[PDB]
Structure formats: structure tokens, C-alpha cells
Amino acid sequence: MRYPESLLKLTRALSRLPGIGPKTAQRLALHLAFHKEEAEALAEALEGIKRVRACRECGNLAEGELCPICQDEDRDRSLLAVVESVADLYALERSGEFRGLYHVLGGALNPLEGIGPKELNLEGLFRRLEGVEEVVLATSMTVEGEATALYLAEELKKRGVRVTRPAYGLPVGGSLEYADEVTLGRALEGRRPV
């Protein structure tokens, strides 16, 4: 469709973003061209995020050295949560049921994609076990996240610390009829007294 170079340069850059097809790229590029003020603000914010980097301790996004979680003094440092990504950390933190610390991996273990202990931010985890009561293995509830969990569990039980896994089960407001048979089966097996 497009022909001006800076417009096409913008549309092409917008298309590199994940979950942004060429049709959305064009609509946004046109919009940015017709709203100079907004486009300048976005360029300012993009320059602004050059500073941001992985936290020295977590792997969580941080202004400068330490992330907001690590440099919070009101934090139960007896608790630690292993997590695959920053998006998952935010979800956990948004839940409100956790005031521990986090360790952010680079992803999950995956033999089929050659992803293993060296590729993940893993060796850093074992250096931070000082006065850590509990480690929550809060990896994804997938084949890959479960494989990661079992590996961390084996390695953590060796080094003398208890490990817990968040519950498989039904989601809140969920009907039994529309849940899958595996999730439903785990929910039954992990049923609790009341």
C-alpha cells in the first residue's frame, strides 16, 4: 500500500513487534503520522527505556541496578518465587497473595529447542538461598514448566530447602462441563477437606 519512506520505515518497524500484523502496522503508522504530539511522546518514552535493564539479583526489569521488589525493605525474604518471565512475576505480584522475593529465569527447560540450565538465568538462584525458608516453584503449568519444576526441586532438595508448587485445579468462576479432563482430574486428586 504505502510509498513515503519514513512512513514505510515506521510501518516496517511496527511489524517487527510480536502479535502485530501488517494491517495493524499500517493503521498505527498512519495514526502516528497524523498525531505528531503523540508520536514525539512515544519516541521520548522509547529513548526513556534505554536505561532499563535486568536486575542484578532477580532478572526482573529495573531502573538502574536493583528492581523495585529487591530494594523494598518490607519484603518477606524467607520466601522466594522462581518464575519463567517478568510477565509472570507481574501476574503473581498483581494476585496480592505473595510478599516474597522472585528469581526470574530466561524461560523454561526444553530439550526439543536445546534450552537447558546454561541458557536460563539458573546458577544465580543458588547464590541467594541465605535465610530462605521456602522456594515457590512458580513456573508455568505446562510440560516445559513442569520439567523445569522437577529439576529445580531435585537441585533445591539437595541443597537443604523445602519447595512448593502452586495448585493445579479449576479456575475461579469455572464450570466442570467446559473444563478439560486433565485439569478436572488433577482438581479431584488434589481435593482438600472443608
Positions that interact with a copy of itself (CB under 8 A): 1-7, 9-10, 12-14, 16-20, 24, 26-33, 36, 38-52, 61-63, 67-68, 86-87, 90-91, 93-94
x/- site string to Cl ion, residues 18 to 57, per CB under 5 A? Answer: ---x-xx---------------------------------
Owner of C-alpha cell 523495585: 68
191 binds, among Zn ion, Cl ion, a copy of itself, none (CB under 5 to 8 A by kind): none
26 or 156, CB closer to a copy of itself?
26
Fill in the DSSP letter of residue 110. B
Return the range that interacts with Zn ion (CB under 5 A); candidates 10-18, 30-38, 61-69, 128-136: 61-69
End-to-end Cα separation, the chain, in angstroms:
63
Question: Quick check: 70 binds Zn ion (CB under 5 A)?
Answer: yes
Strand partners, 99: none
The helix or strand, by DSSP H or E, that contains position 148, with its residue range, turns out to be helix 143-158
Question: Quick check: 190 binds Cl ion (CB under 5 A)?
Answer: no
Contact pick of 32, 58, 135, 156 for Zn ion (by CB under 5 A): 58
In the three-class reduction of DSSP (H, G, I as helix; E, B as strand; rest coil), residue 123 is classed as coil
93 or 155, CB closer to a copy of itself?
93
Rounded CA separation 108/85 (Å): 9
Rounded CA separation 130/77 (Å): 9
Rounded CA separation 191/44 (Å): 52
Residues that bind Zn ion (CB under 5 A): 55, 57-58, 60, 67, 70
